[PDB]
Design an enzyme around this catalytic site. Structure first.
Site, PDB file in Angstrom:
ATOM      1  CG  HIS B  14      -1.764   1.158   1.317  1.00  0.00           C
ATOM      2  ND1 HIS B  14      -1.281   2.386   1.691  1.00  0.00           N
ATOM      3  CD2 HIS B  14      -3.061   1.275   0.980  1.00  0.00           C
ATOM      4  CE1 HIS B  14      -2.289   3.225   1.556  1.00  0.00           C
ATOM      5  NE2 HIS B  14      -3.402   2.594   1.173  1.00  0.00           N
ATOM      6  CG  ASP B  16      -0.773   6.298   2.713  1.00  0.00           C
ATOM      7  OD1 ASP B  16      -0.223   7.287   2.143  1.00  0.00           O
ATOM      8  OD2 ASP B  16      -2.026   6.236   2.930  1.00  0.00           O
ATOM      9  CE  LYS B  17       1.205   0.812   7.993  1.00  0.00           C
ATOM     10  NZ  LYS B  17       2.469   1.430   8.486  1.00  0.00           N
ATOM     11  CD  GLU B  42       7.850  13.109   8.029  1.00  0.00           C
ATOM     12  OE1 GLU B  42       7.371  11.959   7.918  1.00  0.00           O
ATOM     13  OE2 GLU B  42       7.704  13.801   9.065  1.00  0.00           O
ATOM     14  CD  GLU B  55      13.157  18.168   9.292  1.00  0.00           C
ATOM     15  OE1 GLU B  55      12.592  17.407  10.109  1.00  0.00           O
ATOM     16  OE2 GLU B  55      12.578  18.610   8.275  1.00  0.00           O
ATOM     17  CE  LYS B 166      -7.167   1.107   2.072  1.00  0.00           C
ATOM     18  NZ  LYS B 166      -7.742   2.459   1.776  1.00  0.00           N
ATOM     19  CG  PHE B 235      -6.707  -3.007  -6.875  1.00  0.00           C
ATOM     20  CD1 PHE B 235      -5.701  -2.071  -7.154  1.00  0.00           C
ATOM     21  CD2 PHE B 235      -6.961  -3.317  -5.552  1.00  0.00           C
ATOM     22  CE1 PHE B 235      -4.909  -1.547  -6.121  1.00  0.00           C
ATOM     23  CE2 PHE B 235      -6.169  -2.820  -4.526  1.00  0.00           C
ATOM     24  CZ  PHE B 235      -5.162  -1.919  -4.809  1.00  0.00           C
ATOM     25  CG  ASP B 243      -3.734   6.529  -2.961  1.00  0.00           C
ATOM     26  OD1 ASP B 243      -4.112   7.711  -3.066  1.00  0.00           O
ATOM     27  OD2 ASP B 243      -3.752   5.891  -1.875  1.00  0.00           O
ATOM     28  CB  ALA B 244       0.303  10.440  -3.836  1.00  0.00           C
ATOM     29  NE  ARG B 249      -2.911  10.952   4.652  1.00  0.00           N
ATOM     30  CZ  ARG B 249      -3.060  11.562   3.483  1.00  0.00           C
ATOM     31  NH1 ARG B 249      -2.307  12.609   3.170  1.00  0.00           N
ATOM     32  NH2 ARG B 249      -4.039  11.206   2.661  1.00  0.00           N
ATOM     33  CE  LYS B 250      -3.856   3.499   4.690  1.00  0.00           C
ATOM     34  NZ  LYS B 250      -4.042   4.953   4.423  1.00  0.00           N
ATOM     35  CE  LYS B 270       7.285  11.510  13.610  1.00  0.00           C
ATOM     36  NZ  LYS B 270       6.122  11.912  14.357  1.00  0.00           N
ATOM     37  CE  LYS B 274      13.020  13.663  15.701  1.00  0.00           C
ATOM     38  NZ  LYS B 274      14.490  13.759  15.870  1.00  0.00           N
ATOM     39  CG  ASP B 276       4.577  12.474  17.557  1.00  0.00           C
ATOM     40  OD1 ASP B 276       3.732  12.889  18.394  1.00  0.00           O
ATOM     41  OD2 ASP B 276       4.898  13.106  16.538  1.00  0.00           O
TER      42      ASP B 276
HETATM   43  C1  LIG Z   1       9.775  20.029  16.931  1.00  0.00           C
HETATM   44  S1  LIG Z   1       9.403  19.845  15.182  1.00  0.00           S
HETATM   45  C2  LIG Z   1       9.446  18.048  14.907  1.00  0.00           C
HETATM   46  C3  LIG Z   1      10.790  17.348  15.066  1.00  0.00           C
HETATM   47  C4  LIG Z   1      11.753  17.735  13.943  1.00  0.00           C
HETATM   48  N1  LIG Z   1      11.315  17.098  12.683  1.00  0.00           N
HETATM   49  C5  LIG Z   1      13.181  17.359  14.294  1.00  0.00           C
HETATM   50  O1  LIG Z   1      13.960  17.286  13.271  1.00  0.00           O
HETATM   51  O2  LIG Z   1      13.548  17.178  15.440  1.00  0.00           O
HETATM   52  C6  LIG Z   1       7.638  19.804  15.066  1.00  0.00           C
HETATM   53  C7  LIG Z   1       6.948  21.146  15.064  1.00  0.00           C
HETATM   54  O3  LIG Z   1       7.370  21.861  16.248  1.00  0.00           O
HETATM   55  C8  LIG Z   1       7.542  23.232  15.924  1.00  0.00           C
HETATM   56  N2  LIG Z   1       8.936  23.613  16.109  1.00  0.00           N
HETATM   57  C9  LIG Z   1       9.930  23.733  15.166  1.00  0.00           C
HETATM   58  N3  LIG Z   1      11.064  24.184  15.645  1.00  0.00           N
HETATM   59  C10 LIG Z   1      10.778  24.442  16.979  1.00  0.00           C
HETATM   60  C11 LIG Z   1      11.542  24.993  18.025  1.00  0.00           C
HETATM   61  N4  LIG Z   1      12.811  25.415  17.889  1.00  0.00           N
HETATM   62  N5  LIG Z   1      10.950  25.122  19.237  1.00  0.00           N
HETATM   63  C12 LIG Z   1       9.685  24.719  19.386  1.00  0.00           C
HETATM   64  N6  LIG Z   1       8.860  24.199  18.473  1.00  0.00           N
HETATM   65  C13 LIG Z   1       9.482  24.059  17.287  1.00  0.00           C
HETATM   66  C14 LIG Z   1       7.025  23.437  14.503  1.00  0.00           C
HETATM   67  O4  LIG Z   1       5.640  23.719  14.568  1.00  0.00           O
HETATM   68  C15 LIG Z   1       7.295  22.063  13.901  1.00  0.00           C
HETATM   69  O5  LIG Z   1       6.486  21.795  12.758  1.00  0.00           O
HETATM   70  C1  LIG Z   2      -8.850   4.045  -3.575  1.00  0.00           C
HETATM   71  S1  LIG Z   2      -7.218   4.779  -3.398  1.00  0.00           S
HETATM   72  C2  LIG Z   2      -7.549   6.450  -2.763  1.00  0.00           C
HETATM   73  C3  LIG Z   2      -8.281   7.416  -3.685  1.00  0.00           C
HETATM   74  C4  LIG Z   2      -7.401   7.833  -4.863  1.00  0.00           C
HETATM   75  N1  LIG Z   2      -6.338   8.742  -4.383  1.00  0.00           N
HETATM   76  C5  LIG Z   2      -8.227   8.470  -5.965  1.00  0.00           C
HETATM   77  O1  LIG Z   2      -7.532   9.186  -6.781  1.00  0.00           O
HETATM   78  O2  LIG Z   2      -9.425   8.290  -6.074  1.00  0.00           O
HETATM   79  C6  LIG Z   2      -6.645   4.300  -1.794  1.00  0.00           C
HETATM   80  C7  LIG Z   2      -6.030   2.925  -1.698  1.00  0.00           C
HETATM   81  O3  LIG Z   2      -6.993   1.974  -2.206  1.00  0.00           O
HETATM   82  C8  LIG Z   2      -6.311   0.975  -2.948  1.00  0.00           C
HETATM   83  N2  LIG Z   2      -6.738   1.016  -4.341  1.00  0.00           N
HETATM   84  C9  LIG Z   2      -6.113   1.601  -5.418  1.00  0.00           C
HETATM   85  N3  LIG Z   2      -6.714   1.383  -6.562  1.00  0.00           N
HETATM   86  C10 LIG Z   2      -7.766   0.542  -6.226  1.00  0.00           C
HETATM   87  C11 LIG Z   2      -8.749  -0.105  -6.999  1.00  0.00           C
HETATM   88  N4  LIG Z   2      -8.837  -0.013  -8.336  1.00  0.00           N
HETATM   89  N5  LIG Z   2      -9.649  -0.884  -6.350  1.00  0.00           N
HETATM   90  C12 LIG Z   2      -9.568  -0.997  -5.021  1.00  0.00           C
HETATM   91  N6  LIG Z   2      -8.680  -0.449  -4.188  1.00  0.00           N
HETATM   92  C13 LIG Z   2      -7.815   0.339  -4.856  1.00  0.00           C
HETATM   93  C14 LIG Z   2      -4.815   1.197  -2.750  1.00  0.00           C
HETATM   94  O4  LIG Z   2      -4.408   0.489  -1.594  1.00  0.00           O
HETATM   95  C15 LIG Z   2      -4.777   2.706  -2.532  1.00  0.00           C
HETATM   96  O5  LIG Z   2      -3.603   3.132  -1.844  1.00  0.00           O
END
Ligand SMILES: C[S@@+](CC[C@H](N)C(=O)[O-])C[C@H]1O[C@@H](n2cnc3c(N)ncnc32)[C@H](O)[C@@H]1O
Ligand SMILES: C[S@@+](CC[C@H](N)C(=O)[O-])C[C@H]1O[C@@H](n2cnc3c(N)ncnc32)[C@H](O)[C@@H]1O
Ligand SMILES: CCOc1nc(N(C)C)nc(=O)[nH]1
Ligand SMILES: CCOc1nc(N(C)C)nc(=O)[nH]1
Lengths: 380, 380
Positions: B14, B16-17, B42, B55, B166, B235, B243-244, B249-250, B270, B274, B276
């Protein structure tokens, strides 16, 4: 019976939120010309870059460079001193048509009311009587703190403010027969990007006096409230330069702040056939209708779908013990009053209207009397 | 007292995965050389492209082209006929160092045990006694259906299968004094990418006989169970071409499938600072320890942090009415038994170990006896 609960919110210039807003600016630009546009626009932001990736099939003629740059301008990133500039950033586009396999399985040759869900998935709606808008106080306050920062930045009160901010509010609640009653604010966090000149003490004093006191009622604040204001000590680097952003990475900020539940789907950049958005809006509408209808004090609603199938596969209600009626009875009331097919939701909630960029910061719920925020009068 | 609940899962291919797995392959590659790497990677996937954005500050020498391509090869995208090929795709890198403003506020010159949280945020842990692994049956079954598809693809049983899939499972439950008891499987959805040659009936028959029956106990399936197998009808186009995909996102597939709650943070890409990720793993560890310790039948744990601050700002427990002890008493037990500072969690859960790519498909919880899945013996 007391407990703590925490929710966060982010500002318009938080990089994930920039992405949501750009995705929805793209969606709205398409809908202005083609109400039936099929849009799945993801945005990625990093230093100097906005990349659009996804699938769009539409009759609209959209100037992506202009739409993206205008959205960034609105947010306030207009100079390299701020770390990002709409005039000079790179805008990259990797957009293709919607997969024909999806199109044929979802909407091609289908009567609109009978269109299939655009994907499988689950979605939740939630509502709580703790605020008039039927939202958790924790997240309402967190959103208002970011809105206040943007207001003071835009009116020139605190010219050292930059668009990227995060807030977090912890409230101490009392439990009341399954409902929740806010008592006081236990802890507030505010982090906001700032210029090179302002010192930490000036920022902390302004955040307490001009931001928190201007938003949070004094009755919630006391000698014990904990304040974490600019806790990192320095936040000059911000926006996409400080942290890569992506669409659909603030889904809890967009919804209920940890309360209730989430099915995982992002809202921004998606037209109504993507039930991740339309069915979540309809589930909110159901939950708020049950609370404003006096049937429960708080409630969680789940719905689910299969790709290509119009009717939901399941609907469920959890009332936390806040109704005299059983959840079975509430579910029957929901089934008698709502039709959660996407081709019906679109009509009830007017989901071809280009109002989506307005939803992409400060939460999708509890604001501005959007159609999903106007309760339906229930018949039973 | 019966109700329906639905959860979904997705396969390794998938889009996203794919992104989550690549982000974690990058993290593990860094940790193999530098256990103290600061990683926020990311991944974005679309037709022919993997883009890394984020980063990283690390002493490791990582070949991003090789790491990304090897992860895609493992997933099974190895030919243009499948819509994606590790050998010939574009790999783009937009990776910079961690913001020095974040570094100074979080970890520079700090004793490891006293390192600050890498960001603010909220995180939840959940556990339920409905399965031995203390996970909701809905999501366990949904994950196992995707694992079965990948098994039959890799052993050549169903050579028409492609990596993108899915699944979605709706279970009918009974309520039991706040706990939940699975009765039967109400509806199953399976959608999986396939070759141009296989017909719909052959796929539907195989999905029922070789996938569902090989995973779901017959006692849960009956004459009323609803099957939505390849409901879109076609499919062939799949993976990033269909699909991007984006990292993070999961997040509901990664956790509890709609049960419990989520704080919004993504896990993949991460390092331990982090929260999270690290605090969500620790919250799972707490929740599972409470259930396996016989203190409740199901439980939700919330924790929250401020950037740069080591101790959590709040800890809360919701036991759904499944304990004789009050939530106040359970919270005291948690505070006596756990230290949720990130600099302690890292030691308890061995979070500098490069095992993260293993977590990035089929859920982070309820599998493989990772440290957060081994209950702590509670003293009270
Ligand atoms: C802390 S950053 C996430 C971790 C980061 N990707 C890293 O490289 O460590 C997440 C969010 O916190 C905020 N942020 C960025 N720099 C920060 C800083 N110096 N102090 C506090 N919050 C910050 C921004 O809103 C950012 O999108
Ligand atoms: C249906 S797509 C999301 C919507 C899509 N971005 C669009 O442009 O309509 C989401 C996920 O469903 C699955 N998918 C993709 N094409 C499909 C299809 N023809 N039938 C069923 N599932 C599908 C894939 O796992 C994909 O990442
Ligand atoms: C909306 C359905 O969500 C839930 N329902 C229930 N019950 C007990 C009905 N428990 C949950 O945890 N969630
Ligand atoms: C873990 C804290 O989450 C929750 N706690 C409670 N109560 C009533 C304590 N209600 C919720 O909806 N969530």
């Amino acid at each position: 019976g007391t407990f703590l609960f925490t929710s966060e919110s982010v500002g318009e210039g938080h990089p994930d939120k920039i992405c949501d807003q750009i995705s929805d600016a793209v969606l709205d630009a398409h809908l202005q010309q083609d109400p039936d546009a099929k849009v799945a626009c993801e945005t990625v932001a990093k230093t100097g870059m906005i990349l659009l990736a996804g699938e769009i099939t539409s009759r609209a003629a959209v100037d992506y460079q202009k739409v993206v740059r205008e959205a960034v301008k609105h947010i306030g990133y207009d100079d390299s001193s701020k770390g990002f500039d709409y005039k000079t950033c790179n805008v990259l586009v990797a957009l293709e048509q919607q997969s024909p396999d999806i199109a044929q399985g979802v909407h091609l040759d289908r009567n609109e009311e009978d269109i299939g869900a655009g994907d499988q998935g689950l979605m939740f709606g939630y509502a709580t009587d703790e605020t008039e808008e039927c939202m958790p106080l924790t997240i309402v306050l967190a959103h208002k703190l970011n809105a206040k920062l943007a207001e003071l930045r835009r009116n020139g009160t605190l010219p050292w403010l930059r668009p990227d901010s995060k807030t977090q509010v912890t409230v101490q609640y009392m439990q009341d027969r399954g409902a929740v009653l806010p008592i006081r604010v236990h802890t507030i966090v505010i982090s906001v990007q700032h210029d090179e000149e302002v010192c930490l003490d000036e920022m902390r004093d302004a955040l307490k006096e001009k931001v928190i006191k201007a938003v949070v009622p004094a009755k919630y604040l006391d000698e014990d409230t904990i304040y974490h204001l600019q806790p990192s000590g320095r936040f000059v680097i911000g926006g996409p330069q400080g942290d890569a952003g992506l669409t659909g990475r603030k889904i809890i900020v967009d919804t209920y702040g940890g309360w209730g539940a989430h099915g995982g789907g992002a809202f921004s950049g998606k037209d109504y056939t993507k039930v991740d958005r339309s069915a979540a809006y309809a589930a909110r509408w159901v939950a708020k209708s049950l609370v404003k209808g006096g049937l429960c004090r708080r409630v969680l609603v789940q719905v689910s779908y299969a790709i290509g199938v119009s009717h939901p596969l399941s609907i469920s209600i959890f009332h936390y013990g806040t109704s005299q009626k059983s959840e079975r009875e509430l579910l029957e009331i929901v089934k008698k009053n709502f039709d959660l097919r996407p081709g019906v939701i679109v009509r009830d909630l007017d989901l071809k209207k280009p109002i989506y960029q307005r939803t992409a910061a400060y939460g999708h719920f509890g604001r501005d009397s959007f159609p999903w925020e106007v309760p339906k009068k229930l018949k039973y």
